[PDB]
Amino acid sequence: RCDPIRISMCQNLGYNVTKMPNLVGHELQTDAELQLTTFTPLIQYGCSSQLQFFLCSVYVPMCTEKINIPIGPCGGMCLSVKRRCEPVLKEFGFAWPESLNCSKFPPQNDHNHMCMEGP
Ligand SMILES: *[C@@H]1O[C@H](CO)[C@@H](O)[C@H](O)[C@H]1NC(C)=O
Numbered sequence: 001r002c003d004p005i006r007i008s009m010c011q012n013l014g015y016n017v018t019k020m021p022n023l024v025g026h027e028l029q030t031d032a033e034l035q036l037t038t039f040t041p042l043i044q045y046g047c048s049s050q051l052q053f054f055l056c057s058v059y060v061p062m063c064t065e066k067i068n069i070p071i072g073p074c075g076g077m078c079l080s081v082k083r084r085c086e087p088v089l090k091e092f093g094f095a096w097p098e099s100l101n102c103s104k105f106p107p108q109n110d111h112n113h114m115c116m117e118g119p
Pocket of ligand 1: 101102103104
């Protein structure tokens with residue numbers, strides 16, 4: 001069964017229940033929340049209107065009682081967010097992390113693939 005989302009920046013999305021471990025390995029939401037501080041400067045810069053949803057869908061993926069795998073982002077949204085936000089990371093000498101490699105996510109939502117295409 002699913003657990004409430006405790007990460008404040010991941011409230012008020014279309015869903016509000018999750019199930020750890022997330023798509024980046026964290027068993028604890030608080031650990032996900034600390035790691036997310038890595039991105040708060042991008043979040044207030046505002047490189048992408050989708051960054052918030054995207055990060056949340058990875059760090060606290062959607063959970064339903066009816067489906068027994070976590071539901072993360074589709075690759076389309078990942079690519080769109082990366083294209084807007086990686087250049088800002090690059091200005092400061094950083095790069096889009098392997099942990100957020102868009103190839104890890106299903107390319108689109110399907111019969112075969114379940115994922116959130118987001119806002
Ligand atoms: C992302 O993953 C693929 C293999 O899954 C790899 O070829 C690629 O170089 C990785 N990194 C990217 C695209 O930056």
